[PDB]
Amino acid sequence: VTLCSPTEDDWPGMFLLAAASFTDFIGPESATAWRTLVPTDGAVVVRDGSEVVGMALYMDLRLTVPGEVVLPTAGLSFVAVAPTHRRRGLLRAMCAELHRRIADSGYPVAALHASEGGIYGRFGYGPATTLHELTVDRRFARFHADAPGGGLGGSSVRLVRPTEHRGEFEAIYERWRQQVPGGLLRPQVLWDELLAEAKAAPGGDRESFALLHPDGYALYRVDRTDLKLARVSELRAVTADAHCALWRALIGLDSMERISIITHPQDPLPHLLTDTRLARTTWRQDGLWLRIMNVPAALEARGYAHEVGEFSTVLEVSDGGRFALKIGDGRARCTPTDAAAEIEMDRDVLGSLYLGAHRASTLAAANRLRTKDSQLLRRLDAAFASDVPVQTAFEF
Amino acid sequence: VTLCSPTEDDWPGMFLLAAASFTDFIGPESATAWRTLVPTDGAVVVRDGSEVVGMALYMDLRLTVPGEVVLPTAGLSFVAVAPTHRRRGLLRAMCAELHRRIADSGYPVAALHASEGGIYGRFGYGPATTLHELTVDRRFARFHADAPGGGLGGSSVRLVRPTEHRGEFEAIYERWRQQVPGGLLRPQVLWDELLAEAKAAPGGDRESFALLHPDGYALYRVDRTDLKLARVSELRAVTADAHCALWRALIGLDSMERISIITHPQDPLPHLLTDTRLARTTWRQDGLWLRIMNVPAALEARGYAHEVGEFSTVLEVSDGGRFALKIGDGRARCTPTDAAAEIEMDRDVLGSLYLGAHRASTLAAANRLRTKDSQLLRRLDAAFASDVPVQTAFEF
Amino acid sequence: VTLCSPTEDDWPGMFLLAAASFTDFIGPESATAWRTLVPTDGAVVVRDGSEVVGMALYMDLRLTVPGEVVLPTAGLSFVAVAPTHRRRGLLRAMCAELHRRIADSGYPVAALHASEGGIYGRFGYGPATTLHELTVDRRFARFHADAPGGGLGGSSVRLVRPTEHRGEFEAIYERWRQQVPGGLLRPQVLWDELLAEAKAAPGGDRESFALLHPDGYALYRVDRTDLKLARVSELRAVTADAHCALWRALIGLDSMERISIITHPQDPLPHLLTDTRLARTTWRQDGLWLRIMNVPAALEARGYAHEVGEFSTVLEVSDGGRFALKIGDGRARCTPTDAAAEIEMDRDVLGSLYLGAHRASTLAAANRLRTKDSQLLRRLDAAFASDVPVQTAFEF
Amino acid sequence: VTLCSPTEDDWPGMFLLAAASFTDFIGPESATAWRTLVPTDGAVVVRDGSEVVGMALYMDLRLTVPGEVVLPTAGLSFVAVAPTHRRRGLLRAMCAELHRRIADSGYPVAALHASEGGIYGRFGYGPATTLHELTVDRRFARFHADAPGGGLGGSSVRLVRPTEHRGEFEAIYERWRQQVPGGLLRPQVLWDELLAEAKAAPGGDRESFALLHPDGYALYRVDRTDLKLARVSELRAVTADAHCALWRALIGLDSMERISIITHPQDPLPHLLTDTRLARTTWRQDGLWLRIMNVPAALEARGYAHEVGEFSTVLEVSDGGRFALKIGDGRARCTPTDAAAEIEMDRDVLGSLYLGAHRASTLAAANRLRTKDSQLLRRLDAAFASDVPVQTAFEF
Ligand SMILES: Nc1nc(SCCCN2CCCCC2)nc2sc3c(c12)CC[C@H](c1ccccc1)C3
Ligand SMILES: Nc1nc(SCCCN2CCCCC2)nc2sc3c(c12)CC[C@H](c1ccccc1)C3
Ligand SMILES: Nc1nc(SCCCN2CCCCC2)nc2sc3c(c12)CC[C@H](c1ccccc1)C3
Ligand SMILES: Nc1nc(SCCCN2CCCCC2)nc2sc3c(c12)CC[C@H](c1ccccc1)C3
Ligand SMILES: [Mg+2]
Ligand SMILES: [Mg+2]
Ligand SMILES: [Mg+2]
Ligand SMILES: [Mg+2]
Ligand code: NA
Ligand code: NA
Ligand code: NA
Ligand code: NA
Ligand code: NA
Ligand code: NA
Ligand code: NA
Ligand code: NA
Ligand code: NA
Ligand code: NA
Ligand code: NA
Ligand code: NA
Ligand code: NA
Ligand code: NA
Ligand code: NA
Ligand code: NA
């Protein structure tokens, strides 16, 4: 049970473990696209003897954070331990090796999507974005008088084949990801993947259509089994006009009873309707998880609310260092100190605060975050809060 | 079709319309309790000829708002138009008469619970609190190391008959409602009602038990039909210790598979567990709706975030006045002006901002709230935000 | 295993068999009401030794038939064989004894409601009325421009307690039953029963409300478990105005999603809406079954279509006689003959034709009704057809 | 937003709109077959600028009507407005253009199948045939003694591959459609389509088998997901012998629990069984919709009941002309008149009466059809009634 960097000879074993470990796994032809995002020495396998009983890797990602600042991000993925090799400490060993390589390579943060919500806390990962399913009963949906783009003249939205407007989607997404906390750069090979899933699979998924606006798009398909349900896989709007326009078009799908979308908690859709309740929240889950690899690098890199005035404190991260934190003019200076701590928290908790999705006051009430000054709690709450609401880019 | 204040002769007709209009309606013996909360001239009926084809009334309530400030509040309730008299403008007429009486009596705000989410916007009501159902699969629930009250020695929580500890619940609730935006004073007659529903109804609801802590309580009953489900009707905790303690006790209901509760979006429960995901959000709806009856009275009465620095603007409420608004040191001065408006919004939108449940930025993205300065949007967002998260007290 | 007329000593045994045989059975206090409709010598029991292992009885009813003609009708009911005494020929024996008494008493027809649709054919009973469940999704329901009673001024429909308007319901029903094929005289004791079921049963059925028009009524209750469903137990309208008015009022139940009613196939409701499809047919079953006890008495008593011109034929009923049938001016003369038969049918088939619910052509296509002249089939079809569509009165 | 006849360049745009608008749409290879049924100038598109935002066309059909009379029929189909271009009056404009072309080409009637039941009334379409799903629990099904084809010797029904007996199905259908109101000529290209759907689609529909009798056939497949359910897609019987024989064979599918079929309300199947109730009605919907394009041409072309004696009246169709209508010897003479109207109805209502599926008395009770003489209502009822019951041929 030795821990190694896989050779090309190990790939067959990794794809087997992958197929047995993840049901979504397409197979080794879609694995070519994602493989380009794994750097040399981004992967560990555990051999037994020999076959692969454990694997883990990270991908080179670019994550947008508050202040429209883009961080290099180790994206953890393809983590699996063989059913034959459970409770053998293989995840603890593989995670420790990758976290060393990630740290030593100069990534300030790592990120993942969680298969279960109880595994990644103990390795310093905090859920940092919230997914929110909205289901609209579109038979009752009337837009509010105040809603944009409900006047006379033409619609600026077009029904299109996705695959004939790759360039326009690319441009819109590229604007979207640079401007929104949670945004990831989506490279060419993943657009290649996305448009392959846009066409109908025999005995599988239906044709995906696209609604295209100058400043936004929505990809949608009718559900396999429920033929009165449209699933919006992805809606990217750069402007409020684009967002409203696209939803006017989705509510225009007169053959559907229900439109469903995985969105963020601050999605303005409910406020576009006369009856806010018509956009029911049907599902809520953790999206992206962050591990802050370097506390001073990460805290310094992101912007903070200009509204809160200058303040200073000492933050202790459990087995992660003690820092003099000074915030003002929406910049932070974060420097080593042995002064008495005013705030303590595990490293997972900082991940959860970092993109503004969770309030420090809420984590305080759960005692995940200790402080004796309720004024300092208010100031952290206000400082770490994000002007642009945090969204989830794409699963990896 | 004349609009009148009901006499005692009209009550029979109102109870008939009530039974035909609301399925929850107990009947005329529970109506005695609530009747004490309706002031003289708090009710209108519409007679035809004669029987009652329309009714509406308000109750004298005390609503807690940010800054632990308690407003007199007209609580709108018992609104019904006979199925025989729809689309006859009876609601518009009854609502207009009560809003006059409410305004002329010196209530700064009115409030209601909505049977449908598409009726009350046009009468100036904005949804102001969010209800959040959490269902915990308690078979998997382990508390986090950081969680309070998981040490050796005795538990401070007691399993009790609710009806033998009315005094203690009263005291705890009274502390709770004074300290939390959305809180209502609960008078004696409504405690009398609440403890009557605590005992088992033949072929109806099961016995309610109580978990009692010095600084908190939870009332729960097993669901009628699903015997592995506990429904927490009401959990009031004044301290984080009390909140965690009470949930340690609820997760200790080893004969249940699932605990369900209607709570608020900032409930710290998910953060008390090692697996945040075990507290699934199963349901989300508008709770309390506000109509701001007097804009300057209401804006001046509530506290604002101390973090945001002093700023001034002109707010226009559609057919509701234009005001010079100056906010600083968490107080607002709100005075008449004919200066050019920097923010416009319908009166319903102000209701939605008032308790801090909805961000001005979110309503802006839906164009419910117009401004050309994105800096002013950030400042409103920050100012109107509530330190103590807004909760929902009790339905009326 | 002797076959007898029950004494008062036998009642306990009959109520036991009743409770074990029919789940709807209230118990011996509701049995007092119906007992008044059973004539002396209207009941048979089978004793074993002793306890009651078999029972059957008939009630004295008045059935309206085409031409607004009212026939004395033996209503068969309370038929049960003990689970301990199946496949012992007890039903064949009890049915034969009652059919003798019914025949010898001068009833031209007997009738029943069937617990299963495969038992009563062999005893000469034919299904004669069709039940039709309509479920309206009332959220989408808009009345057609052409629909009556959608103008300005007051509604003539009232929401009422059923029990305070017994006299008005009685009068309306009495007009209804005299004018409609399938109508039964409803005696006082059954109105006493009906209004007892109008009030709420603890852990059972909800309060019944009434919609009252000068020329019609509807009794409705909200469903026990599904609180967005209204069940219309009974709607009697004497005029089209009344029928439309009452449905305008039912569609006005704005707190319900769905109105359901058991009605007849020719119910005009679908044609009152802009979208006929909103009144979905959710359920269809045989209602009232007829056994023609005396072929010439029954054929002569009912009216026939005036449209079809005079024609003559020979009808043979299998083990029921051969008759010269002459129809014209909507009267029939039916007299013994030994002339060659032109139409043969079992006695059950005549029951099915008798109220106009089933076309002779349809039963011909199934070869339940033999003839070699397709012209004679058209003439029977046209003659037996009912101008007023056949409805179902009440179960017994 | 100009309204044009599409060129071959427009087809790509029409197939896109088709795929986004109808979920059943196969794709552009099945579109070749149906395209042969669209005449030159049978289609309109609406371009925006450009892409297709609206389309509609009619197909040249031959509809059988009462009296075994075959009318040329514009079959309306492929109607779609882009989700981006709702509430823009595009359907009203496209429908008006096609109705002009249909009228000017000398079609006496147009017809369609409705995606929703609330759209086509306002364009003069009335639902003219009723679809009726019968589900048989075939485990309980015993044929009645009176049923044909239950004697000794061989069965005349064969289990066959559909595709090896195209000629025999064609011949039987051709006899069926000529003899039955609602019948459509089915051209070669649609038989080509039908037998392509008879073979198994990978991850889709199962193999279709055929039961073949000299004078009838049934196509059936086992349901994709429910393997104890047989779906009879199509059963055509020319004789009662054939109809009973084929059902004896379907009830012989001993591995199925349930046989389901979409049939007509007068289907004799229930009367072939000892228990009529075993054929439950599980579903009812409008089938074919008629717009009478020329009132005198249509009324004169169809046969009428010989049973009703000669009578004369004045019919007014709302914005459709006033006519002296004289009916006798099952022919109608229909001529212009300015005499006072005795019957008024919208044009949609005439469509509903035309094939005999709806009684004039029923539409009268809904006030869709006004007259002050109840005798004239009886005469229309009787005259328009169809000897052969009206069926639905095939969806288009
Ligand atoms: N990261 C990936 N994602 C996806 S789809 C994302 C949805 C799953 N998601 C993840 C869990 C939770 C929520 C849903 N597919 C693929 S294939 C593939 C990778 C990968 C990683 C690199 C790998 C490899 C292995 C050996 C040698 C070279 C490269 C091949
Ligand atoms: N406000 C009330 N609430 C309740 S339970 C609350 C739950 C309903 N809720 C409301 C809708 C949305 C969500 C659920 N019960 C009662 S009874 C009663 C009142 C009343 C008001 C006063 C009234 C009256 C009438 C005529 C004369 C004198 C007094 C009698
Ligand atoms: N006919 C009755 N109906 C009903 S409710 C009808 C619904 C049942 N229906 C019937 C089956 C199919 C469909 C639903 N309840 C009652 S109680 C009662 C009778 C009876 C008959 C007379 C009997 C008796 C016995 C011994 C001595 C004296 C009198 C007492
Ligand atoms: N009429 C058709 N039906 C069907 S399947 C019927 C079931 C749908 N039905 C309809 C709605 C309600 C109930 C189910 N498929 C096809 S493809 C096709 C047509 C068409 C029409 C002609 C068209 C075209 C377009 C542009 C250029 C040339 C030709 C191509
Ligand atoms: Mg975050
Ligand atoms: Mg609020
Ligand atoms: Mg009948
Ligand atoms: Mg018809
Ligand atoms: Na596509
Ligand atoms: Na998609
Ligand atoms: Na709303
Ligand atoms: Na500060
Ligand atoms: Na108790
Ligand atoms: Na409770
Ligand atoms: Na977690
Ligand atoms: Na400021
Ligand atoms: Na009542
Ligand atoms: Na009822
Ligand atoms: Na319709
Ligand atoms: Na005749
Ligand atoms: Na086959
Ligand atoms: Na088939
Ligand atoms: Na039967
Ligand atoms: Na006549």
Curated annotation (Swiss-Prot), chains A, B, C, D:
Enzymatic class: transferase
Keyword set includes Acyltransferase: yes
EC code(s) of this entry: 2.3.1.-
Reaction(s) catalysed by this chain's protein: L-lysyl-[protein] + acetyl-CoA = N(6)-acetyl-L-lysyl-[protein] + CoA + H(+)
Effect annotated for changing D286A: Nearly abolishes catalytic activity on AG substrates
The organism's place on the tree of life at top rank: Bacteria
Entry's family note: Belongs to the acetyltransferase Eis family.
Protein name, entry field: N-acetyltransferase Eis
The organism of origin for this protein: Mycobacterium tuberculosis (strain ATCC 25618 / H37Rv)
